């Protein structure tokens, strides 16, 4: 009965900001597949992209929020989510 949808993605150029939102009816992130981050209240980030992303969530809206800053073409990937696997969204950087 739990449904996950990746939203808020799209096309962004270099130096921009992107915010990802997922609606869930203890969260992890995926991209390609590669790990991104984890959250529960402990939070971790990948060493490859350390110092660029930020992951937050709130049980009030049962949603999880991921923040990407100063995106570059080096991270062109399709972004997924995992608690069951989300549909995922493709995002490129130009």
């Amino acid at each position: 009965q739990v449904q996950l949808v990746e939203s808020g993605g799209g096309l962004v150029q270099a130096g921009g900001s992107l915010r990802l939102s997922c609606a869930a009816s203890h969260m992890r992130w995926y991209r390609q597949r590669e790990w991104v981050a984890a959250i529960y209240a402990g939070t971790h980030y990948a060493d490859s992209v350390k110092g660029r992303f930020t992951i937050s969530r709130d049980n009030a809206k049962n949603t999880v929020y991921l923040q990407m800053n100063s995106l570059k073409p080096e991270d062109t990937a399709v972004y997924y989510c995992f608690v069951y696997i989300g549909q995922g969204t493709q995002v490129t950087v130009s």
């Binding site: 203890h26 984890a38 529960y40 971790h44 990948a46 060493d47 069951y84």
Partner: protein
């Protein structure tokens, strides 16, 4: 018997002291419910990765530090077992010698 059993005792002791055999042996038996990283709602990929990192797979996804801790724990236990075995062996020898110096009728 003494000379018959000295060598296998040596093999077991040195293997446990090195710890690699025990490391690869009981790796999938590790307890991970304490660690909050390993949720794995699938409950199957968890055992897969648990058996996967100790051999040669670094898998640099923040789990490496965790895996080292796990490795360390197992390694620690291995050492104890070795020494534990050693202790028991020596104790056995002593009491065994006691028999050879108690039940023996000859001087």
């Amino acid at each position: 018997t003494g000379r018959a059993v000295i060598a296998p005792l040596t093999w077991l002791a040195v293997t446990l002291l090195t710890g690699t055999y025990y490391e690869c042996a009981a790796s999938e038996f590790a307890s991970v419910d304490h660690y909050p990283m390993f949720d794995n709602v699938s409950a199957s990929k968890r055992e897969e990765i648990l058996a996967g990192f100790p051999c040669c797979r670094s898998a640099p996804s923040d789990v490496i530090l965790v895996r080292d801790e796990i490795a360390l724990l197992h390694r620690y236990q291995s050492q104890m077992l070795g020494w534990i075995l050693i202790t028991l062996a020596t104790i056995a020898a002593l009491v065994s010698c006691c028999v050879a110096k108690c039940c023996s009728p000859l001087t």
